[model samples]
Structure formats: structure tokens, C-alpha cells
Target: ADVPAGVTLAEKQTLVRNNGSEVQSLDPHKIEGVPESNISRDLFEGLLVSDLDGHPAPGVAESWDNKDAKVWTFHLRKDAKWSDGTPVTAQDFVYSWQRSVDPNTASPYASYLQYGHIAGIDEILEGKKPITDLGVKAIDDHTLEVTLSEPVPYFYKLLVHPSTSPVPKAAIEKFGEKWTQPGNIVTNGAYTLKDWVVNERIVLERSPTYWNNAKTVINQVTYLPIASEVTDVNRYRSGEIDMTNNSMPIELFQKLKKEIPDEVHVDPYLCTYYYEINNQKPPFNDVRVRTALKLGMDRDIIVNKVKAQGNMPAYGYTPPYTDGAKLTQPEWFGWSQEKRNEEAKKLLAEAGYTADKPLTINLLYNTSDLHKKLAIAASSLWKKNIGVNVKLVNQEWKTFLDTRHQGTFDVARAGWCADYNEPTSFLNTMLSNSSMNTAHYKSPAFDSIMAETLKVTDEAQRTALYTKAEQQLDKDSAIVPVYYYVNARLVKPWVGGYTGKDPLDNTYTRNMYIVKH
Candidate 1:
């Protein structure tokens, strides 16, 4: 592959990578997608940042201490500066934390502030008090204090999330909604936005003002939002791209592994792909119907036949190998395919479905080749086994999110990746009051266990409670767990310091360097 005629030496040395989808937004507080998070991670520095192993490491904050279970103090680095040369202060964190929980800001993740047990966050989120009433405070120009309503062992891990990153108040106030535009945005990260062309590519240049500028590598990086798995592979083969995190198809995964073994990387991912039943809607609203639908689908076929990637079939919502224990499913539910089918038929019959009067419902999914193929396979299974008519509907990502949120679909495709390596990251979503509970499934029993689990500090007791809650969710058929994911990725041989094994598959370009052969 030949370089473009106008390519400068700087562009020639740039690392080109694949972003699986178009980023939703660059504003740290507003981002929800993984692609958006990846970009935000590069352009902003959180008080705490994740290392290659997903453990918390110092970023803007040089050090932090917890004097008690409910309080933490982070001492910021006085030398840190934003891209604009403005000093990064503790006030930036105070402003950012308050804005995220402010009801007026309408952040989707604002609910996490309360869920994370940040003291007084509930009041701000509920509109009962002003943003200033939020728990985070600037003790001085270089120190920040955080008060928590409860002791959360994973509190530091949560700080690594993009939603917890600081934003320069002056930049936002001066530029308004357009503050995130390239050249307008002021960042405290190792990289600053150089250019962002929607649905095409986003270019980032090394930040001179970064606190760790001397240690940072990778002079420039260009993220191509290549949606098609085939296109991504083609571009990588042509040397137009250097890496991709999660855009490789299963068929190509095997092909690439065999032909380019050095480039292919596989690792366990903390994610569960599932389908959410709009429990508020009729037909699906019935427990028998939901249970029957869950039992009818052959997960083995979906994993083996449809998706040939080393994806584990999920009998439970929480993936295995998370938080030191493998989640267990009910023995009866783990019966052979034939036995499950027999039980499914009986449940369907009890729910008033038969060959004469078949149950018909729509299965909705966001547009993606893998999603469409899986939906088709499941639809075929339901038709053959339970004599149900399954209608398939596909929508783009944004519209799909909105439709699911509104509970306007029969059964919609859903997946959750761990925000932190904790069971609560998965279990809490099913809580009745959770903003992410698209299924609208309510179980007081499940919610009660979650509430108690949060307050319990005993690891063994908390695990037992979470397991009980998860089992209750399974009993209610709150969601149909399809499979657990594996991070199938590719990185060029020239790239060094690549950490593709992390469950999150978070690549810090600042830590990577291009090696000349």
C-alpha cells in the first residue's frame, strides 16, 4: 500500500485505527457508547485513570487517600495544565461532578452518581436540591474532597469512567454547545482533538500541555469509524488501518488468525449479549410467555452455527469469570436442547398458544450484520419449536436506543459491558428504578436484594445476595441471555505496547509507539 501523495512526515507516522461505530458525542458527561468512551478517554484526563489491566492509576490526581469508608480526598498535580495552557484545578472536578448530576443537564449516566452512593447526589438528581448541594467539593486549588453515602469498594474503579472526568468551565461557557468542536475544545489528556469529520474520521494530535507529555508516545492517531466488519478487514489488509478492537466478524476472525496469526488477538470480554422483553407490553408481559420465549431459543445454535467466534453461550445474565466467581444458572433451565424445547412448548400451550392460534411478536434489533443474523436464527428456532410467528425489525443505533427506552418494542436486542469489574454493573441495570432498565421488568424481590447487597460489606454475603437477585431475574425471564462476548481484535506488527487483552479493550495511544522494521 502506497502512502497518499500529499502525506506529510507527521501524517506518515500517524497510527490509524478503527472505531467500530460513529461516536455519539465528545462531551464526556453525555457519551454512552463504547466508541465515544474510547475517544473521550484520549481527550480528557480523569482524576483516576485505568492502567492496561483496568486497575485505577493516577492521572490528574497525583495521589488519593480514604480516611474513612465514607470520605476520600484526591490531591491533584499542580503542574497539570489543560490544552489551552490553563491550570487544571480541583474546581474543574467540582464543576464537572455537579453538572453531571444536575437534573437540568439531563445526563443519562446522572443516575450513576446516586447509584454510586455519592453523598447528596440523590438530591441533585431528583431536583430536590441545587447542583452545588452535590457531595464533591474543592478544598483548595489542588485538593478535592468526595463524600459518599455508603462505602463502595469499587469507588476508585468508577472514577476511571469518562463520566467522572473533568471539563474546563471556561471552554464550555465560552463556546456553548460547540465547545467540543476541534480547536475549540480544551483537554487535559495526552492527546487533543485535531479534526473530527462525522461518520468519517477523527484525528488527534499529541498534546504538548499534557502533564505526562515527556512520557507520551504516538505522535498522532486517526480513528476511522468503519461500521462494516468486511470493510474494516479490507482496510487493515491494505495497510490503510493499523488496528481494530471489536469490528471483526467471526468468519474473518478465524481467517485472520490462520493467515495473520501475529495480528489477531483474542481475550475475555466482560459483556453479555441479550434480548430485552418489553415487559410493560401485552403478550410479552405474561411470565409464561416470556419464559417460553427464553426456553425456545437454542443458544447452542446461535453460538456455534450463527456466531463462530469463541463466544460462550449465556445461561445467566452475568458473564462467568467476573469478580472472582462464575455465575450459576438453574439446573432445570440448563437442560438439553430437546428437553428445553419440550418445556417451552408446554409453557407456550399454557400461555394460550397452539398451532391453531400461534403467538406472534416482533423481535427488534439495531442494524448490524451479526445482530441481523442472530435475530434471523432465533426467529427460525421459535417458529419451528413453539409454532410462533416472529417478526424481525431493525433500526439504527440512536433510533433503536430511543425505541427501547420508550418500551415501544416487543423484544429488543440488548447488551451490557461492565462499567467496572463488578456484578453490580450488571445486576443494578435490572432494578425497577434504573434508567437503563429498558425491559421495564419490575421485581420487588430482585430490587430488595440489590438494595441490601449495596449496603452489605461482607463479600461472601453480597455475592450470595446478588446471585439470588440474578436467579430471581432469570425466573421472571426479565431478559433472554444469548451469549458472552470475547474481544476479537487485530493490531499491526509495528505497533508496540498494545494491550488488547483487557475486558474493556481500552487502548491508550499515549502508551503505544510505532516501531520501524
Candidate 2:
């Protein structure tokens, strides 16, 4: 077992690869969350990349035209080529996007492409016509065209996402179901998936055929899925891992931040941790019951005491900093503790529950110790304030995912990390009844506000429209927003040149080279 000396890195790295849990699937069109994002990051490439400032400068397409706003045109980089040495063409994008919208493909994230920024895409996804009629057209080997349902200011920026990247039709046909596995995969990105050893590690090797490989400094990189914070931190400390995500515990972080200030990093994440009620269920189906529950809890204690680092109580589904709006977070949520408590009492009394006869509700949370602590504290606060006896249930992350999606739980904890840096990306996707709407919360007034906003392109008018929508959401207490998030990462001394500060934290590893003395 110890005699192999001449083996290349492709062979040597496979034994140490670490991918957490099982990859649900390798299809890029089917990716949904973080796990899927990790896999797709190595296998796909988009039209533009995020600069250090998170601005979409350029990617495969060197230049684009939006003179009409409705019809967008792109001129691809001449050097761009697929893994097979074939030049990347506009046809590939057409095929890839059509596949995503196809009913048979069943991509959960497909809605990102079909709705929102892209025009004519919604009709294709809804089976109105053939995929070729969906507005995206390839004029030549280096030119692409797209038409949108409405004029969108952020459509180009939206293209710099994995869901918008093109796929090679040849690779899918040749490899069939195993296209994303090992040597069968193809790439037009700066890196290619060289190997994936399930539940272990996935390796990305620099692609010389890449149009931007000259600046693609990282020759080889490994993505190790480290779920447990303790284990992840231990690996970073022992010099076994290069980077670890999420912040460390407060006490421990203070010590390390002083000792190794350069290694500790924190930034406000475009995410909101919240709770969703199964509106289809019995008591929760009653709007009064939902309103009473939202009003009963004290958000201040939960943020300050239970989750120390997580501050900023949320008023609507989209956390502040989304869409780069100055007044997003502070304008809507100025509710004081006394006012919140008073509102809770009135709502509970109106719903026919009081100190003499308490309402009983079950609370569902993930099994993480942090979440459990918060749930317990929240339940206690409700009991003391509104005489509601809450039963708290904890489920592991995987089981919790399935149960929540099935709407099996009466009330459950959930969060949304922005897929891109746009307001509609968070609002239209999460709150609108047409999208996720996991909470099962619905309001004609809210939907009307969003719809009218989409029909307009004026900046001031659009902002005002969303402002009205956010106030309605907050007033109705459609979903309880506990806290907005900030990302903390501990990095080893070996990595360098990492940049990009978008709300989504999209970084170009091509610029990140291992610091070797």
C-alpha cells in the first residue's frame, strides 16, 4: 500500500477527496442549494464572472449589447472552447437553457432562468410553445441573442450564475447519466472536474483550454465537505485544510482573532434565518393563529442572548443589503419591544386565547445545538408572554429538509441565502405565491404590489413598489424573521489573492494562488 511513487496528482488526490453526505445528483440543471452549488461550481462556466467588487464584468462573452433592453445580444470570446477542443458556440447556451425549462428535466432552480430577468422564458417553461421559440437564439459560433418578457436592468448580471451557464449537448449524449462523473465530464470554465469520490472529495484541475487560464493561478484545488464546525476548525488548526467556513464560537473566536487576526474574516451574508408555518395545516391555516404566534415572541432575546453574532431582526423575507438598497432593512423594521409585546397580547386575545386558556403549538427546528438553544428560549418567551404551550421538535438537517418540503411539520425553521445580488432574486422567489412560498402564506395585496413593480422599469417607482410590499409582509407577519446573517471564515496562511465581495460571496479561484515561499 506504500509503494506508488510515480502516480500523477489525478490519481494521488482521489484517495483523500472529501464530499459530505451523498451528492443527490451530478446534473447541473438539477442543482438546488449549497451542496449542489459546490458541485456545479467546478463543472460549469457562465457568460461573465464577478470582479473583486461583485460586479459582472465579463466571462465567456467579451462584450454584450442591450440597446433595446428587451433583446440582448452577446459576442463570445474567440478563445472560448469546450473540454473537447471545440470552440464554444451560441448553440450550446440555447440547448442548455432549453433543457432546464423542459418539463422532463424538472429543475427546481430552472425558475430562476424562466422567470425574473429573462423574457419569453416563462412561456417556454409553462409549455406554451417549443423550446426554440423561447427567445434565446444563437446567430453564429460567437454570437448569442436573448429576449426578455420585460426590460430588466440586472439581466446581464443574472447571467453570471451557475443556473445560467451552458452545457454541452455532446457530453450529455455520450456520457448519458454519468456525464458529471470523472473523465466523462467536459468544461469550458477555468477548471475541470478531474475526479469525484462520493462522500469524500471533488478535485478541480486548471483547464489549459480555458479562455482565462492565463490568470487562472490556482493549478489544482480540492473541495472537502466539512459539515461539523469542530472538525472543520480542527483541520484548519492542524494545517490539514486550507479554509473553513462559518464563524467559530464567540469565546474561541475572540482568542483566535487576537492571535491570528489575518486568518479571521467576517462579512454580512445575503441571508435571513426565519420560520415558516404550514399554512395548509389546521390551526396555522387560520390567519389569526399565525398572526398571534408571530406577535407573541420576543426577537430581541433570541438575537442578543441565544444567537450572539446574529443581530438585525428581519421585517420581510429578504434580508437587508439585498438589491443594494440603502433603506431596505431599517425603513420597514422599527418595531420596539413594548409595541411588539402589546401587539402580541391583542392578537392572541382576538384569536380567542388568553392566560386562562392557552393555545398549544409545535415548534420544529434543526438538531444543531445552536438552533435547539434558540428554539427552547423562543418557546419559553411565548409561554411567558402569551400563554402558548409550545412543543419543540429537533430533526437532523437531511430529515428536516424532507419533512419541511413535504409540509409535514406545523411550523419549521428555514433560511435563504441569496442566489444572486438582486431584490427579486430573494423577494419574488421566496414571497410570491408563484414561487417557493414554503410558508404557504398568501396575500392578494402583497402579490399585486410585486406584479405592478415588475411591469415598471423606473428605478424610483420600482423601489417604492417593493417598499409597499415589504410593509404589507411585515404588517401581516406572514413569516417570522428571526435574524439576518453574517459569514465568518477562518483561513490558513497558505491561500492568497482571494477576492470578490458581492452579497453572494462569488470568488474567482483563478486569481487565488497558493502562497509558496
Candidate 3:
């Protein structure tokens, strides 16, 4: 019954991955969810791509020159082609970037264009200038140029993100909003969509026309949207799936690691899981109330008893790996657990809440067993330490996002993953004008420091400014810092050429091939 060493299994070349949640959208310009971002990498090629170590590498653009700090020129690969056999041109990028910044397109991430300091992009987003003045131009079929309003060190890294990927104007104009349909889509990456069924599965097959298709060994890839972590792990154990990146439950992390050491992987992730207090509301509007809520909970208990992963209890908004970590520690780190609790009670009483008349508030979180567990544990802590009554409410992901954005809840669960590896990515969310500022917390001093940090070129000086800005935010009690995240997942041993640990969790399947052992 022994199999031959050279014999290959039928499913060896086919990779199946789990999508923890359903993808909201597939259009590169409109995608905001992580599920869609992961899938988009396979279907569309951007100017650059993140290598195994999360470093920028050429994708459609073979090379780029930035001799003039304000202007960058990218030379596209001549051999790249769309799935429909049309040549990939520099104009594709020009059109795609313009669409993202154009107010008419109404992209949720249009603000990112202004953040990147693209020349004239802010004017276009404000409807003060035409899209033609958006500072991107195609000099020829292979040459593309971009002008920036200011020097951004991470400009190249930002290109690898899905929001910068090119979209076919022909398809969008013809099919309208339905251009992402399976039959109408045109892609220029390693794979093309084979089938898409909502809440079920999305199938993709290798594209023969890709610029570097010869290096793509995986013949087909399938993404299954499974909501339950228990179900995802069960399928992974039965050999029904190849990988489950983020859907595994934290309580089961250690057990799985011991049972299947090689398959279980853990790595540092550049993400912060926290809670947002609706600062506009009555009870939370008081600074003392906000500070009491933040200091009352034991972050150690949350990481040890709840998460059970080696996640660091976050004291600052930025993760430890980023340069912004050196700025400040958690405001309550110096106090013992008992003393912190006692001080929290004092603050709550001062804020007009006593044991007889408890402060009642509702806690909101998305629908997930893990989230529910965390909410229950935190509520118990608050009830015991500060004599506050918390009502737990759960909603689906889409509804949860909308409700939080509208500032309709007293307290809600929130988490942020860095768009690029910088402190600004997290700090900017608290700005008064940020669309992602769900808590509606704003401070003129914090905003001024951030503006100054953006203009400083020296690394040491910039870090000093970032540190000051973060300290200002912490002093103002912008949000509660729960813990920094770790990328815990399961990947089969047969899946070769996969990077298990990267800060951004960016993985490419182009070089991945099954090993027949």
C-alpha cells in the first residue's frame, strides 16, 4: 500500500483556504474588509506586491525611479496581460487611482488619497478640481508617472495594498456596478475567478496570461467563507481544507499546538484590539467616567484567561513592533491590580455614580463566541470593581460596523490593523476629520502634533513627535487599549513556500507548490 515518491495527488495542486467571514465587495476601489483584501491579491496585480517578509517587490511594474522626491516613474512589465488577452497598460493604473480619489466615485477609502499626499488628490476629493488634475499620468503604454504633494517614506509600501490595484474601465463602463460578476470581470494577476457563490465558496484558477505565470505552481485556489471557528478547525482536521488563518478560537490554540505542533503557527501581528467609548453620550462624556472604565478592567486577565495566546496587553495605541511604542506605556501600568480597582471606584463615585445608584450602560460587540466571552468577562470586572451595570448586545459584522460608525452605542468593541507599518496609520484614525473615528473623540493639541510629525524628515525627531502625540491621546482617554494581536493559525505541512509569520500577514501563493511525500 506504499505510495510512490514521485506520484502526485489530484488535490495537491489545488489550495483551499478559509475566509472567516463573507467578503463585502470585490471591486478593488470599493473593498474595505480584510476578507476582500486577501482575495483581491489573487485576482488583481498592483504596481507592487509584498514579499514573504512584507517588503515591497515589483508586480505589474517591474521597476520604479524616485530621483525627484516629489515625482516617481514606474515602468510596467511588457508581458503582462488581462485574463481576456488584452495587454496591461500604464493607463490602467492612472484610471484606477483617479477613480479612488474622485468624489463622484465615493470610495470610503478616498481619504487615503489625501493621507498619501498625492498631488492635487485632496482637491479632487473635495470636488474643487477635476480628476484629470489628480497628478497621475501615463506617458506611454509602459510608462506611468505620479506626483506627490509631500515626501512619504512609505509610498512604495502603500502600493501593495488593494486600494491601489488597477481596475478595467471597459468592464465597469459596460457592466456598471455589476462589473465584478464572474462573467464580466477582467483581471491581470496569477488567478482568475472561476466561480463565486455568496456565503459558500469562491473558486479561482491559474491564469495562463499573467506576466509571471510560469512561476505560479498552484493550479487552482478555493476560498470558503466559514463563520464558525469550530467548523473551520473541524474541516482543517478532516483534511478538507489547507489553511485557516484567523478563524481558530483562542481557547483551543494551546490544545491544537500540542496535538499538531507543525500545523499550528503563531506570529506577531500589527493589530490592536480595543473598545471605543461613545464620547458624545452622557455618562461617557465625563472624562472621569472614561478614565475609570479604562483603568477598572485587568488587561492581564483578558490576555491570559480569555485570549490564552501570547498577545501583549496593550497600554499604548501602537503595537510594540512599531517605532511609536517607545513613546508611552499604559497609563495604569505602574499601579497594582487592587490599587487600580480602588482608584477606579473613587473616580466612578466622583463622577456621580455610587453603589446605591449604579452607572448602567450597554456594551456592544459583533457576533462571535470569542467576542461574547471577552464581553462577559469585562462586564463582570466592571460590575465588581466600579459597581456599573453593563448590558451586553451582539450584532452581525456589517450591522456592527454601521452602528458604531453612526455612534449609536454607549460602548462598543473595536480593533485596528495597520494599513502600512507606521504609527500614523493608528494615530490618524483619532483625527477630527478621519472617517474611521467611530468614538468621535477629537483634540486640537493631538491634531497639531500629528501635523508637525508629518512634515519632519529626521527619524529621531519624527519619533519624538509621534511619542508626544500618542501621550496626548492617552492623557485624553481617546479609547481603551485592550491587547495587541497575534496571528494564530493552522497550515498543513504539505503547503510549501508559505511564510508563516509576517507583520502584515501578507501571503502570496504564486511560488507555493504541494510536496508529495
Candidate 4:
């Protein structure tokens, strides 16, 4: 690599190559809330990958058959091989699925496999059956079979995720508890993890032993973890980094947007930032307490003051853009400042919160400037509307996640960004039964609609079902959405070809390269 120093260089040359030989210990079992999904994208080969048009294209598993609504068979790529020269056989996939559903793995994403129609996985997650009893079978070294609970139209797309990839039995047995640690990692994809340590950076190098190393590109890549958007922007400005994602200052964003409108992109990220009520807490357990908290805010003011510019207010579980189509906001959706305040009073009164009595509640938020702004705004709205004391508490990202996962907070502000383009990616992870529903909010009606939606093969019917489910979510007031996200980043003039796409899937990096004059 050539170092950029004083005096612009002439005829600068750099050589990079991809060889698919090395294996990574990047575990695919855990994908929730992690920013290192790129490790999975590079080191693991899924059954399919989405094409440029967002359609599922085959990956390791070439072809599959739906024997019936509940039974499916996969035809493995005869030539696939692991980094250690081991053949990537159907048994590998069988082993990987079993591992993912294994009780010991406790993978939060195991639901995706089930949601996508992997047979018997739901029973395992629901503790109704042992993972070993699940219906997956390796018919032979080259053929694998799966049985599902229902017919899933987006099954192929779900296969593109790391959760569905095969893991080498040799690697699992060899590394054991220390499998993900360096020097013991194994992979079957184009690249391998050179190094990874949480809270630090991750480095990936080409896998020379990879089965298809010849077609791989980009020899070495580094993923630097810069949590702060300002820090990431500064790094890009100083030419110390290749690319960054997340919001930049509003003025800077506008400047960049004008300079390169074509390249300055914006898309509705499938995520929901919402407030949750911990039902286990005394007053919150009462529907009235929860309703009061939910209805006691002006969502518009919160969106304008707290959310980054252009963020849309949330009226339901689904974002404005669902299935690449706009869904009508709830009628009298209470998206405006006046409507929200009025709705808050009505709901609080119905929930038994007298204006003079006022309820005391705490609000938890991540210790970021943006999060703090939202927290303060929300607190102010509740105070003004109901004369309640809304205490604000902030914690680091990791701490917030841990506490939230444990359901230790009274009321918390949280967000969930989609891992893929599917609506199920949002619904299943947060609201599905016994999921990230730490708030203990549950509705059988909502769950049934989502379950039914998965079985329908027609796109229109599917969208309509999700719309109904979203409306039900709004009615429950299980969570109050603040805004729909818009990915924002500032790129230096010298940087080109970066798409700043959803980093959760790591597909956006495919086109990144240095700017050439």
C-alpha cells in the first residue's frame, strides 16, 4: 500500500487480490445489534445472495425444490470446498442448521429460519422440542432437506443471510469454545477474518485456499468501529478512512446533497425508534399506565427537534416504506403536534391519569447526543401535557442493550434497523412472541396476522396483511414510534463510489474504491 504524504505523488500503484482460502471464526449465529455483519458476508457463503435488483440469487446451494408446503430439498454446489480443503457438503449445512437451533446457541435470529419456513425450528425455539428433533436432514453428502411449518415466499431471500449459512464441522470441533478467537477461525467464503476484537477494529484478508479465490477481489480490508458520527466524519475529512455511515450535521448534509445530488442518496431504512413500557413495573402493568405514557407525547415536535432532518414520524410498527411501496399513515394518525397532544390527554384520562395527580416515570436512553436530545424532548412533552415527572437516564450503547435485553429499565427508548429488505425482518425481531419484546407487550391478534401473512404467496395480499398488523400495533400502543430513519453521511470530495447503503447486510461495500484523479 502506498502512503499519501507531502507532495502529491505521480503514478501511484497498489496491488490487491482476493483468494478464498482462509477461514474465519466469525460466528453467524449472533447477528442482532452487531455492526460486524461484514465479517459474515466475507467469510461465510449463504444459500443465496440478492442480485442488483434485490432478487434472490443462488449461492453455495445451487438449486432447491419445494417438495410440499412444509418440505424442501436443496441441491448443493458439487464443487464447493472449505478453506482447509474440506468439501462443503450437504452435511455441513445440516450441521450448521442444527447448531443454530441448538439450545446452547440461543440465537435470537433462529426465528428467521423458522419464519422463512424451516420446519420444526419454531418448536425448538418455543421449547416444545429439542433441536435435534427438528426436521432437517442430509439426504446425502450433496443433498439436504428441510421441512417447514408453512410455505414461505421469501425463503430464498432469508437464505442469503448468515443465519442460514453452513459451518464447517471440523472448525467447530477443533475450536470448541474458542472457535471465534483468532488463529482458530474457519470460513468457506471469499475472505477470512485476519483479526477481530470487540470495541476495536476488524481486519479481513483474502482466503487463498478459498474454492473460488480466482473470482474474489479486494485482498485486505479493515472495518474500523467509530461509534460517533462526528468522529467518522472527521476521519473521512482527514483522509484517514475510506467511508463512513450515519448522520452528519444538517448543514454539511445539505452542502453535500447539492454538490452530488445523484450520489447523495437517501432511503427509508426499515427501522423503528420507539418508547417501551416495562409491564413488570408496578403502575406500567396497568393498561392505563402504559396508555398514558404512550399518548402523552407530541410526536411531531419530537421528530423535528430530536430526529435528524428528514426523518419521518412513526405512527405504527411498519415504516412509511413497506415492501418498497408507501403505506397510508393511520387515519387521524396523531402525527401532528396538536393531534398528538390531544390524543395524549384522552388516552391518559381513559387510563386513569388525572391531570393534577400526574404519574412519575423514568425514561432510559443511549448516552449519545441525538439520543439525549430525543429523551429531553420526550420528557418535556410528557411534563407539559400531563404534569408528570419524566426522569431521564443515559447509558453507553452496550450497557443500554444489556439492560434493555434484561428488561431492567422502567421505560426506554430503543431502535431496530432491518437486517434485510423483508418486513418480517422488522416484525419478527422486535414484536414476535418471546422476542426482543422485553417490554412484555403481546397481542395474539397481531401475531396471527403476521403468521398468516408469511403463508400467502401473493405480494398484494402480503402487503395488505402487514398493513393490518401495523394498524393493530398502533391500536395496542405497545410502543410509541418516534421517527423513521434516513441514513446520512458526509463524504469528502476525494472519496467516490461509496453507496452508504445499509451496513447491517454489508452488501453496500461491493462498489467502494479510492478516488482517481
Best by TM-score: 1
**For each candidate, how many residue pairs have backbone atoms clashing (under 3 Å)?**
0, 9, 0, 14
C-alpha positional error of residue 121 in candidate 3 after TM-score superposition, expressed in Å: 2.5
Ranking by TM-score: 1, 3, 2, 4
Q: How do the residues 387-445 of candidate 3 rate in per-residue lDDT, one tens digit apiece? A: 78999999776678778878889999877787777788778788776656788887888
Alpha-carbon local distance difference test for all models: 0.81, 0.69, 0.82, 0.65
- Cα distance off (Å), candidate 3, residue 260: 0.8
Model 1's number of clashes is 0
Worst 10 residues of 4 by lDDT: 12-21
Tens digit per residue, CA lDDT, model 4, 1-517: 1223442322321112111112222578755453535557767887776553445676777898875455778788887877777788877887888888776776656666666657677678777888777778889998888877777655666777777888777666887767766687777777777776665667777777765566544566666655555566556656665545554544356655676555455654567778877766767777656665666666777776534347877776666665633466766563555665676667667767777777788899865556676788888888887566899988765567668768788899877766567677666654546445666766788788877886677778888777777677666667767777775544444433344444332452333334444
Task: Mark the 10 consecutive residues where model 3 has the least summed lDDT.
Answer: 1-10
The pairs that clash in candidate 1 are: none
User: Could you tell which candidate, 1 or 2, scores higher by lDDT?
Assistant: 1
TM-scores of all models?
A: 0.94, 0.87, 0.93, 0.85
The global Cα lDDT (0 to 1) of model 3 is 0.82
The reply for model 4, stretches above 4 Å from the true place, is: 1-25, 249-252, 255-264, 305-309, 324-326, 332-336, 430-432, 454-458, 491-511, 515-517
Model 4 TM-score (2 dp): 0.85
